[PDB]
Design a protein around this ligand. Structure first.
Ligand code: AIY
Ligand code: AIY
Ligand code: CO
Ligand code: CO
Lengths: 386, 386
C-alpha cells in the first residue's frame, strides 16, 4: 500500500556528488568505465578558485566529481564573495570527509518543486540541517540536510544548465560515450541501526516503506517517494552469523555509516555489460564473480516465461542475475568496489514489466537471489565432486 | 665535461611513487592513458592494512600509486609489527602531503648498489634524512632523504620482485597494454631558489652539472649521475616579466616546491602519441596545443637532415616538437596537467644520435624550442593577417 505521505513535492533523482581527492582522475576513470559523457565543469578555467567539479552524464544520470583546491587560492574570499559554484562546499569538510571515508558519495540530490520549502519542512520535521537554502543566479535553489553518516540529501529546485557557474565542456573533450545507462534507480545506505535511521528519514520526508527484508548478515528496508521514483534502501548489519556481516565490514572500512551502492538503470543491460566488461582490465570497473552454471540452469525454470533460452544464455555470458516479483522481472549485476576501500560499489539494473510508463521498483531489489545463489552454489559443488 | 664525482654507486631510475587519495582510480586512469600494465599490488588482499599500493610498468618504467587506508585498520600495529610493505609510509605524512599539494610525486627512486651506504654518505654530506635504511625480507634495502619540497629521493638496492610484500597481479586483471613507453628519461623539480637547491642536491650526491639555461620566466640547471642516466633538472621562477612565471604559478598552486614533470622515453614516439591522442577524450591524457604550421615549415630547414618530409609531416599531425644539439636530435611533446591543479605534467621523448648504446641526455632538453616556438608564432599570425 502507498499512503502518498510525502511532506513536499519530490520529482526525481537529480545527481550524485562524489567527494574526491583529485576529481580529474576519478571522473576520467568513471567516464571510460561507465560510458558517461563529460557534460559540464566548474574549476579554475571557469573562475572557481575554491573547488574543481566535473559533471558526467548518461541519459538522465548525473555524476558530479568534486575536489578542493588549495585554500590559499581563495583566502581573501568570504561566503558573500565566494567563487565556489556549489556554496555548500567547505574545504575543511571535504578533506575531513575524504580522509575519514575515502572516495565516496557526499550528496544524494533530488529535484523538488521548491528547495527552500523542502528544507524548511524537513527541518521542521526533524531533519538535521547541513546547508541552508541558497539561491544561485536567481534561478536555482539548493539546500542540504543530513541523510546518514556524512551523506547529505540535497534539494535542488529550478525556476525554469546543470548549475549556474558551470560551463558546458568543449566538444573536443566531450566524446559521446554511451553504454546504455539512463538513470539512477536507487541509492542504498549502510547504517549501524536501521530503526532509528528509518524513523529519522521517513520522519522528515514523509517517504513511505516500499519493501523490507529479513542468515544473510543484514536487515534492509526501502523508503520511497509518492510515485516511488525516488527509492532509498537502508541496510544494517546482523551480528552473530557464521560469516562476518558484509555491512559490518563496510562500516569498519568506511569509518561508519555511508552510501553503499548506486543502482544504475540501463535501457539495454546486455549492451551495457558487454561494453563495461570489455573495459574492466583497461581502466574500467571489475565485476563480482559470476554465478555457477547451476544458477543459469535453474533460471529456465524460473523466468523461461520472460526470457528465451538465448536471452538466458546471454545472461550467463555476462554474469547477470535475475529475480522476479509477483509484478515484474529484475536483471541485475554488481561491480567490485569503485575505489581502494571495500565500501561503495555500483549495481547495473534493468526491469521488465509493470507497464501502465513503468512503475518504480518493478520487480523488487533482488531479495530472491540470496536463496537462489546459495542453492545454486550447493548444487554446483555437487556436480564438481560427482 | 664530466667529473664523475658521484659519492656512491648509482645505477638507473627505479620508480616514481605518486601519493594519492584513491590509488585505484589514479592507477586505472594512468594505465589506460599511458599504456602501462598492472604489474604488482600491495593492499588489503595481500595483508597490507596500512596502505594501498599499485604498480604499473611499461618496459623499464615503473609508476607506483599509493594511498592510505583508515588508520583504524592498523591501530594495534607498531613499526616493528607493521603490515605496510613500504615501511617509510606514514598515514599522517600522506594525508598532509595530499591535502597540501594534491596529486603528485612523493618519491623519485633510484637504484643504487647499497642503499644503506648511499643514505649514510648522503646524510654525511648534507642530505636531510627522511626515512632511515630498512631491510625488507633480507633482500631489498630502501632509504629516503629530502630532495626538494616534500619530494624525497629514494634509494633502493637489491642483493640479487618489485618489493617484498608485493604480489604479482592476476593475469586477468593485467591486460598487456603498451604504447611504446620504455623508461624514465628525466624528472624535473620546481623550487623557489635554484642556487641553494642545486648546492644541496649536488652537495650530497656528487651529481655534476650537465646543462643550464637562462624572457622565459625561468632559470634551470640539470644535475647528472656519473654515466648521466640519472638526470634531475631543477627550475626556479624568474620574476619581473610581461607574463607571470609559469614556475611561480606552479609554486602557488602546489603550495611550494615539488616535482614539475616526468619525461618518459618512448621507443616509437609516433606510435605512443597516436595511441595516447586516440584516448585523450576517453579517459586518457590531453596534450598542450600544437605549434602553428610555420613551426613545421621551419623544421625542414632545421632537421631535414635527420627527418624526411614524411617524418616531419607525422610530427605535425601529432603536435611533436623537435630540437637539436650539436650531438643529437630530440623529439618531445607535453601533456596538460595530470590532475586538478596546474602543477605536475608529463613529457614524452625520443632521442636520436649519440650512439656508442645511446648516451644519456642526447640532444638536450629542448632549450632551442623557446626561440623556435616564439618565432614560429610571430610568423603564423603574419600569414593569418596577410
Ligand atoms: C536494497 C538493495 O538494493 C539490495 C540489493 O541491491 C541486493 C539484494 O540482495 C539481498 C540479500 C542477499 C542474501 O544477498 C539479503 O539477505 C537481504 C536481506 C536484502 O535486502 C538483499 C538485497 C535484496 C537488497 O536489499
Ligand atoms: C629541464 C627540462 O626538462 C626542460 C623542458 O623539458 C622544456 C624546455 O623548454 C625551456 C624554455 C622555454 C622558452 O620554453 C626556457 O626558457 C628554459 C630556460 C628551459 O630550461 C627549457 C626547457 C629546455 C627545459 O629546461
Ligand atoms: Co540494489
Ligand atoms: Co623535460
Amino acid at each position: 500500500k502507498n499512503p502518498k505521505s510525502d511532506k513536499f513535492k519530490v520529482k526525481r533523482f537529480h545527481h550524485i556528488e562524489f567527494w574526491c581527492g583529485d576529481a580529474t582522475n576519478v571522473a576520467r576513470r568513471f567516464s571510460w568505465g561507465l560510458g558517461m559523457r563529460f557534460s559540464a565543469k566548474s574549476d579554475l578555467s571557469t573562475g572557481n578558485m575554491v573547488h574543481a567539479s566535473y559533471l558526467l552524464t548518461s541519459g538522465d544520470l548525473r555524476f558530479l566529481f568534486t575536489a578542493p583546491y588549495s585554500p590559499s587560492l581563495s583566502a581573501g574570499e568570504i561566503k558573500p564573495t565566494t567563487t565556489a559554484s556549489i556554496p555548500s562546499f567547505d574545504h575543511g569538510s571535504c578533506r575531513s570527509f575524504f580522509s575519514s571515508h575515502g572516495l565516496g558519495v557526499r550528496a544524494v540530490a533530488i529535484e523538488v518543486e521548491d528547495a527552500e520549502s523542502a528544507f524548511s519542512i524537513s527541518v521542521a520535521n526533524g531533519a538535521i540541517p547541513s546547508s541552508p537554502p541558497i539561491v544561485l543566479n536567481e534561478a536555482v535553489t539548493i539546500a542540504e540536510v543530513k541523510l546518514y553518516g556524512d551523506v547529505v540529501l540535497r534539494y535542488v529546485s529550478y525556476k525554469a544548465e546543470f548549475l549556474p557557474g558551470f560551463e558546458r565542456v568543449e566538444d573536443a573533450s566531450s566524446f559521446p560515450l554511451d553504454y546504455g545507462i539512463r538513470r539512477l534507480d536507487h541509492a542504498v545506505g549502510n547504517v549501524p541501526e536501521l530503526g532509528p535511521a528509518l524513523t529519522y528519514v521517513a520522519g522528515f520526508t514523509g517517504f513511505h516503506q516500499f519493501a523490507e527484508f529479513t542468515e544473510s548478515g543484514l536487515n534492509s528496508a526501502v523508503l520511497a517517494s509518492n510515485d516511488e521514483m525516488v527509492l532509498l534502501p537502508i541496510n544494517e548489519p546482523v551480528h552473530g552469523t557464521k560469516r562476518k556481516s558484509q555491512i559490518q565490514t563496510y562500516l569498519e572500512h568506511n569509518e561508519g555509516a555511508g552510501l553503499q551502492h548506486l543502482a544504475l538503470m540501463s535501457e539495454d543491460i546486455f549492451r551495457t555489460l558487454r561494453e563495461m566488461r570489455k573495459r574492466s582490465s583497461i581502466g574500467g570497473f571489475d565485476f563480482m564473480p559470476s554465478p555457477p552454471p547451476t544458477y543459469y540452469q535453474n533460471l529456465k525454470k524460473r523466468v523461461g516465461d520472460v526470457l528465451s533460452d538465448d536471452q538466458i544464455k546471454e545472461c550467463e555470458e555476462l554474469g547477470i542475475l535475475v529475480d522476479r516479483d509477483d509484478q515484474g522481472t529484475l536483471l541485475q549485476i554488481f561491480t567490485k568496489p569503485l575505489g581502494d576501500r571495500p565500501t561503495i560499489f555500483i549495481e547495473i539494473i534493468q526491469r521488465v514489466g509493470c507497464m501502465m510508463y513503468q512503475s518504480g521498483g518493478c520487480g523488487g531489489f533482488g531479495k530472491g537471489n540470496f536463496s537462489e545463489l546459495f542453492k545454486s552454489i550447493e548444487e554446483y559443488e555437487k556436480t564438481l565432486e560427482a
